[PDB]
Amino acid sequence: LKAQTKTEEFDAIKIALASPDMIRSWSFGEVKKPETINYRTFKPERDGLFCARIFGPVKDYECLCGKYKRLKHRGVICEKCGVEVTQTKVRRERMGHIELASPTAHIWFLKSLPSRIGLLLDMPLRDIERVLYFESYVVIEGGMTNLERQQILTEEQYLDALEEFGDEFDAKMGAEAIQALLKSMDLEQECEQLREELNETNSETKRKKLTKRIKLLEAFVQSGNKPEWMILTVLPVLPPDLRPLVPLDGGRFATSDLNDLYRRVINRNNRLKRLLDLAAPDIIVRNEKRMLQEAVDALLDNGRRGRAITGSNKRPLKSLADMIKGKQGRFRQNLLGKRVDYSGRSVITVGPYLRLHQCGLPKKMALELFKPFIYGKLELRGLATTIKAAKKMVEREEAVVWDILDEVIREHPVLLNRAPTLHRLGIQAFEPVLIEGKAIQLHPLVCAAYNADFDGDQMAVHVPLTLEAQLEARALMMSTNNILSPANGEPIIVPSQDVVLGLYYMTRDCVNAKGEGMVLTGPKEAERLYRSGLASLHARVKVRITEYEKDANGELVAKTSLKDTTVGRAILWMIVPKGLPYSIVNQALGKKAISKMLNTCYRILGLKPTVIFADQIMYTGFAYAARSGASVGIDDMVIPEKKHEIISEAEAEVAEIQEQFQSGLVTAGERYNKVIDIWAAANDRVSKAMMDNLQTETVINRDGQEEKQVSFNSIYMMADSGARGSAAQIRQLAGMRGLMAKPDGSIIETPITANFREGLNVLQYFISTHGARKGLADTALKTANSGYLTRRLVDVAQDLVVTEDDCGTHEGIMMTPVIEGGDVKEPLRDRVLGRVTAEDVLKPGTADILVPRNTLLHEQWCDLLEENSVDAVKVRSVVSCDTDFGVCAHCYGRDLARGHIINKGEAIGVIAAQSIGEPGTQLTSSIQVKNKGSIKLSNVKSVVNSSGKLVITSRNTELKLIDEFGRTKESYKVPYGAVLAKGDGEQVAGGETVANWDPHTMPVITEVSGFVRFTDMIDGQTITRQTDELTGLSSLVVLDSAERTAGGKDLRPALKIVDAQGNDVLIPGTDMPAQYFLPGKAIVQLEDGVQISSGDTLARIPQTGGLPRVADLFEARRPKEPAILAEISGIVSFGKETKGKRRLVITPVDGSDPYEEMIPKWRQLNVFEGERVERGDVISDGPEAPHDILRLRGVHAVTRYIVNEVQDVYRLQGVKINDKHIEVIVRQMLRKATIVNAGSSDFLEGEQVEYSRVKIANRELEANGKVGATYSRDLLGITKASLATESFISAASFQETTRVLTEAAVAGKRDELRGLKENVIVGRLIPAGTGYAYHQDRMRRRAAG
């Protein structure tokens, strides 16, 4: 079958250089005149920038002169003035051209960053411009002569060289010269010579800079382009309708600057054409050629030469490059947004009468929106004659069209959206409910997701026209279909303010009230008791309840009993459906438990029950909150009676330190700290005073004297329930508020004593001002920062989408609780749940598989793992996923707006970036065990001393508390020289002392025992004599090797352990003796001859955060003062120091070639100078560089570094983000890898891990037995990783447009789409989600027969 000719639905795209003939192909005529219109009867002047003959008729299906005006005449060209009679739309299509007089360089290819012409010719830019401007001659194909090829000459030089050899030598100047250079160039032969050269000289720089260029060259050859085309012969002109002349009111016109530019180019070109026929002198024609070049350049890209100005207007005219680039940073058409029909917006409001799936839509709005649907639906039933009649009907607002509108509104969803869209929940689909008013009514439970308040926020509505859009809105973007956060499985529909206060006031209990102690048959007569004003809401009552359980297999079991509860809780139980135990509502129900209720309800019953439950909860919440009569008075805020004393005492305290400063007892800087410390300490007292005087303050009585319980005080109910307000906020109303700080950043030592309830004098307010201002500014800035972070994150991920189903790899990461500091800063069940196992985990007793192989771990599975004591689970991750160019479902996880495992085709990268970026607006000396357990020493070498204690000889040492269950609770790090009262496998209690040491001291101890000798220690050189004046006990202080004398600077002082015989006691179990050298500024303990033992110290040596932190993390930025690591495992050594720095000589016990590095000595050391250290050990402390982690530790280590650090940032702010998303960001980060070995691709080439692996895995079989090449994983920042994209159309968006388009053009890049952004730009179905099927099918049809 014939392949094709005409236009079907196109595949991909291709970009390249254009031949002069290729340019003349698009051109339907040449524009020979600068003229535009007729100036009187405004009409295109033939052969002008605007022409009917060249481009198109001014009116649809009508000739210009007016001969053939009939729609019948089509393919006829008029005889008077040839114009084919066709729609005027073709004036937006037809191109044109201009024959240039002299060749003209294309400014994009000349002035590009690499300067394509330049590096193609291997000719410097300066020389090329020197030639183009006729400043100097350049030889071309010099042949056999005195001169080379690329060599440039001058006037006299060229004249003389011409006088010598007329022929067999050639040189020119100007654009024609560069054209000749490019045309004469033989790519093939040059390639051959470069290949011969690459193989001779062996040097890094030479062969690198050679291989790069030969790569570029052969790329240009295979491209299909040709060098000549870099110099413009023909100049294409853009369609007139894309640079319109269109008129305006008052008679004035308006046109694009492209008309001015083009007109200039045409004018100067014509003048050149005339000057050539006039045989003008060289000095003229050269000037004209330069002017032509300048004009053409100004047309293509303006601002790279002169920045030409438009007629009558100072502002520089906008060129074609500026047409493509656009503005507002990097945005090209549909990224930055665009206008959309069938849409609207308005102020938003309440409406709690609504159901979670619906929203109030104003009558007028819905009418104007669905107006096209109403038109058809009217004449469909026959209510309207024709479409016009329907228009008139809805325009007259006849009473019928309302009821006719109710039809179209019923099952047709609408899209509701807010202004700051972050996470996908920013746009949610609802079901329209006609409302009288101009305001849009929103469901309260969604107010959390939108982050929308009622203070005059506005929302926009969109109509899902096509059937597919309706079903997409209903099955995906629907409100009830997302009850959960994409960031974490926790419910986003959690009740907010009034509702939680209502349920709180319900499930609260009072000590004595109506119906206290009485019994009730059930919830019905409980509510019947309350609604009759008989029994109080909160009272202690035993009721008969029937609670169910689904504990049977797939079946509900019914049970009934007498529960001890309150009347209110019992009334509330009428709501809670089926299997949920009564214990859920038996509590006080704060904002937390009320959420876990919904959560559990979803993880037990299902979606529908959770939704209806949620609606009911909101309803009863608002109801009883209204009934509660909760208010806020001035007497609701209770100021501590003791406060006035707490001030006075504190006011006395400072005075003490005020006097000591005058008597010189304390220094100024010490005084300031003392005063600020006491004043800050007073605030805690007042604050934790008012809290006690608030929470339990109510003192009541039941059949007796007094009994006290939690207070019913309103503001406190609000703060405790979680409705609104908090401890820090109530603290400002009642107790004193803070201590402010001057703009200097330093804190003022006169804190604000008065509060909001109390008056505030002038000063205090004036001081609060800076705090306010800086607060507003800070938030306003952090908005922008969060936005930018989100942008970079979406850019780095994007096209990452679930493609395969199960890649089937056992690979993954080891999931254990974070165990930070004292106890468990995050549990195991969190980091585990929702994530399918890599391999079957086992019970403490083995040969028993509770969870087989890979199975998604849900609530029940995690509960089963919780029954058992298991502290670790291996989990498949996106970073470890073997699937190339995407992620398998069995790796990623489950979590989503639904509890089920992740679907196929969902785009995970986008929701990952969104989940990370949305919350980001909220961002800114001895071990004592807190609990009871058993001591477990991890990774430690130690020794027992003469005191019976245990001293640790290892730098890297861990202390874990493993209780009887076998789970790890406490985890700490134990420094070198620490004294343990316990050992491995011991027993301790809560608060028991285990480890002890000193921070300021780094004790150098001895494993063996014996007398202490002295070697290479000489006074005045290596050491120095100093005796204490308060005691008389001395030590000879080791003099550092910077400050030593002439020849004594070369000796390494040491303490070598000797026995009774005077021999050398060897390091246990080795041939190597034991001698411990001492560093600089290290004071000894015992002198020569004095006998010691184990544990005795030989000598004792003295000594950001927030959102930008996350930014630094994701960008993999190297810190300022990085911790140095040991590059190779071995025993460290100190060579002779040099040049203000110090050599560090590592000594491998294993092979060879002892490695030495330059470390500045000023940096305090860590590593024992005389001991071995594994690769990755800390030679010094401080922040660690991510690259160092990746290189010296590994992928699994560095990914854990990132995730743990960023989570350390977020979790500190009380923000829940599943590790998943961060892991995908990591996957995108380390995507690139630099090859080491060879046999397929190049040597040092940076290339995609997916690409490389897909190659070598193909080379492990067939091919050669294995010719496959080794590589090295590389860590790239999110912005640098985002920089790498196969699609040039996608790259033309966020990157620099010019450079991208040029580099892609010279290469002949074929953009196959396959990505999200590029498909969005070109306006077709996304290669993910709904569209994923389509693009899959086509992808299969492609590359096949």
Partner 1 sequence: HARSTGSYSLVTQQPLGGKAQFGGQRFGEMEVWALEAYGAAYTLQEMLTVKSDDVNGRTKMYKNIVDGNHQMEPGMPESFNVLLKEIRSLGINIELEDE
Partner 2 sequence: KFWATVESSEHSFEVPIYAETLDEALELAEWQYVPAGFEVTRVRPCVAPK
Partner 3 sequence: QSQLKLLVTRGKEQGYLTYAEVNDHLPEDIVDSDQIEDIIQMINDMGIQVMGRTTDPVRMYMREMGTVELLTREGEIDIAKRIEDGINQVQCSVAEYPEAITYLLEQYDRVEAEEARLSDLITGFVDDPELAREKFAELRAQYVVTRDTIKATAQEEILKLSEVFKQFRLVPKQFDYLVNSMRVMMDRVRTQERLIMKLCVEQCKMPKKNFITLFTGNETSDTWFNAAIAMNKPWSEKLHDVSEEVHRALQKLQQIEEETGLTIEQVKDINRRMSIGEAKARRAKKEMVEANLRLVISIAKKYTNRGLQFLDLIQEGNIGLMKAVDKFEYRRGYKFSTYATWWIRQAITRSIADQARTIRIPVHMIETINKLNRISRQMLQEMGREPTPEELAERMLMPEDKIRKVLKIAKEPISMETPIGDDEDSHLGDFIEDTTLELPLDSATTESLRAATHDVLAGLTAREAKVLRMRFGIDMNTDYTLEEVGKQFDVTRERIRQIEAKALRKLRHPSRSEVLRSFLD
Residue numbers at the binding site for partner 2 (CB under 8 A):
204-205, 1117-1122, 1124, 1127-1128, 1138-1139, 1141, 1155-1160, 1236-1237, 1272
253 binds, among partner 1, partner 3, partner 2, none (CB under 5 to 8 A by kind): partner 3
13 binds, among partner 1, Mg ion, partner 3, none (CB under 5 to 8 A by kind): partner 1
The answer to the question of residue 383 lying near partner 1 (CB under 8 A) is no
Binding mask 913-942 for partner 1 (x = CB under 8 A): xx----------------------------
**Closest by alpha carbon to 571, among 610, 522, 518, 605?**
522
User: What is the footprint of partner 1 within residues 339-358 (CB under 8 A)?
Assistant: 339-346
Beta-strand pair 555-566/699-700: unpaired
Among 270, 310, 417, 996, binds partner 1 (CB under 8 A): 417
Q: Which amino acid is at 940?
A: V
User: What is the footprint of Mg ion within residues 425-464 (CB under 5 A)?
Assistant: 453, 455
300 binds, among Mg ion, partner 1, partner 2, none (CB under 5 to 8 A by kind): partner 1
The answer to the question of residue 88 lying near partner 3 (CB under 8 A) is yes
Q: Which amino acid is at 1002?
A: M
Q: Which is nearer to partner 2, 981 or 1159 (CB)?
A: 1159
User: What is the footprint of partner 3 within residues 476-495 (CB under 8 A)?
Assistant: none
252 binds, among partner 2, Zn ion, partner 3, none (CB under 5 to 8 A by kind): partner 3
Q: Which residues, 6+ apart, have CB-to-CB distance to 355 below 8 Å? A: 443, 615
The answer to the question of residue 254 lying near partner 3 (CB under 8 A) is yes
Cα angle value 1310/1312/1315 (rounded, 5°)? 130
Per-residue tokens: 1094? 């184990």
Among 41, 202, 312, 466, binds partner 1 (CB under 8 A): 466
Sign of CA dihedral 613, 615, 616, 620: positive
Packing angle of the helix pair 387-396, 363-381 (nearest 10 deg): 150
**Closest by alpha carbon to 336, among 1321, 1323, 1324?**
1321
Give kind and range of the element (H or E) at residue 657.
Answer: helix 643-662
CB of 347 to Mg ion, least distance (A): 12
Q: At 693, is the secondary structure helix, strand, or coil? A: helix
Q: Which is nearer to partner 3, 1019 or 1242 (CB)?
A: 1242
78 binds, among partner 2, Zn ion, Mg ion, none (CB under 5 to 8 A by kind): Zn ion
User: What is the footprint of partner 3 within residues 185-224 (CB under 8 A)?
Assistant: 205, 208-209, 212
Q: Which residues, 6+ apart, have CB-to-CB distance to 457 below 8 Å? A: 347, 348, 418, 419
Q: Which is nearer to partner 3, 113 or 574 (CB)?
A: 113
User: What is the footprint of partner 3 within residues 134-193 (CB under 8 A)?
Assistant: 134-135
Among 179, 225, 256, 1166, binds partner 3 (CB under 8 A): 256
The answer to the question of residue 1096 lying near partner 3 (CB under 8 A) is no
453 binds, among Mg ion, Zn ion, partner 2, none (CB under 5 to 8 A by kind): Mg ion
CB of 322 to partner 1, least distance (A): 10
Contact 1053, 1078 (CB under 8 A): yes
CA distance 692 to 669: 35
The answer to the question of residue 381 lying near partner 3 (CB under 8 A) is no
The answer to the question of residue 278 lying near partner 3 (CB under 8 A) is yes
1199 binds, among Mg ion, partner 3, partner 1, none (CB under 5 to 8 A by kind): none
Q: At 711, is the secondary structure helix, strand, or coil? A: coil
Among 62, 260, 906, 1318, binds partner 3 (CB under 8 A): 260
Contact 1093, 945 (CB under 8 A): yes
Cα angle value 1089/1094/1095 (rounded, 5°)? 110
The answer to the question of residue 305 lying near partner 3 (CB under 8 A) is yes
Q: Site residues (CB under 5 A) for Zn ion?
A: 63, 65, 67, 78, 80-81, 807, 881, 883, 888, 891
Q: Which is nearer to partner 2, 39 or 1162 (CB)?
A: 1162
The answer to the question of residue 386 lying near partner 3 (CB under 8 A) is yes
1038 binds, among partner 2, Zn ion, Mg ion, none (CB under 5 to 8 A by kind): none
Exposure string over 417-434, b if 16+ CB within 10 A, otherwise e: ebeeebbbbbbbbbbbbe
Contact 1271, 1252 (CB under 8 A): yes
Q: Which is nearer to partner 2, 401 or 1179 (CB)?
A: 1179
The answer to the question of residue 1310 lying near partner 1 (CB under 8 A) is yes
CA distance 401 to 940: 83
Count of residues near partner 1 by CB under 8 A? 116
CB atoms within 10 A of CB 403: 8
Among 13, 518, 1008, 1195, binds partner 1 (CB under 8 A): 13
Task: Show the beta-strand stretches assigned E in 785-922.
Answer: 813-815, 841-842, 849-851, 873-875
User: What is the footprint of partner 1 within residues 751-790 (CB under 8 A)?
Assistant: 790
User: What is the footprint of partner 3 within residues 611-670 (CB under 8 A)?
Assistant: none
**Cα→Cα distances 48→37, 237, 311, Å:** 8, 11, 19
Q: Which amino acid is at 1276?
A: L
1160 binds, among Zn ion, partner 2, partner 3, none (CB under 5 to 8 A by kind): partner 2
Beta-strand pair 1034-1038/1010-1012: unpaired
Contact 492, 614 (CB under 8 A): no
Q: Which is nearer to partner 1, 137 or 1294 (CB)?
A: 1294
1127 binds, among Mg ion, partner 2, Zn ion, none (CB under 5 to 8 A by kind): partner 2
The answer to the question of residue 246 lying near partner 3 (CB under 8 A) is yes
The answer to the question of residue 237 lying near partner 1 (CB under 8 A) is yes
Scanning 302-310, 536-544, 628-636, 1054-1062 for contacts with partner 3 by CB under 8 A, the matching segment is 302-310
CB of 1148 to partner 2, least distance (A): 11
CB of 1242 to partner 2, least distance (A): 16
The answer to the question of residue 473 lying near partner 1 (CB under 8 A) is yes
The answer to the question of residue 315 lying near partner 3 (CB under 8 A) is yes
881 binds, among partner 1, Zn ion, partner 2, none (CB under 5 to 8 A by kind): Zn ion
User: What is the footprint of partner 3 within residues 1274-1293 (CB under 8 A)?
Assistant: 1280
CA distance 629 to 621: 13
Per-residue tokens: 1343? 């590359």
Contact 253, 245 (CB under 8 A): yes
Q: Which is nearer to Mg ion, 447 or 607 (CB)?
A: 447
Q: Which is nearer to Mg ion, 347 or 626 (CB)?
A: 347
The CA-based diameter of the chain, rounded to the nearest angstrom, is: 129
The answer to the question of residue 37 lying near partner 3 (CB under 8 A) is yes
CB of 1187 to partner 2, least distance (A): 8
The answer to the question of residue 16 lying near partner 1 (CB under 8 A) is yes
Q: At 189, is the secondary structure helix, strand, or coil? A: helix
CA distance 1319 to 993: 64
Contact 540, 516 (CB under 8 A): yes
CA 799 to chain centre: 15
The answer to the question of residue 119 lying near partner 3 (CB under 8 A) is no
CB atoms within 10 A of CB 315: 8
Q: Which is nearer to Mg ion, 423 or 1056 (CB)?
A: 423
The answer to the question of residue 1123 lying near partner 3 (CB under 8 A) is no
Residue where the block lists tokens 């134990």: 974
**Closest by alpha carbon to 838, among 850, 854, 825?**
854
Q: At 1141, is the secondary structure helix, strand, or coil? A: coil
User: What is the footprint of partner 1 within residues 958-977 (CB under 8 A)?
Assistant: none
CA distance 1109 to 1115: 10
Per-residue tokens: 262? 């083009």
Radius of gyration of the chain measured on its C-alpha atoms:
41
List interacting residues with Mg ion (CB under 5 A).
Answer: 453, 455
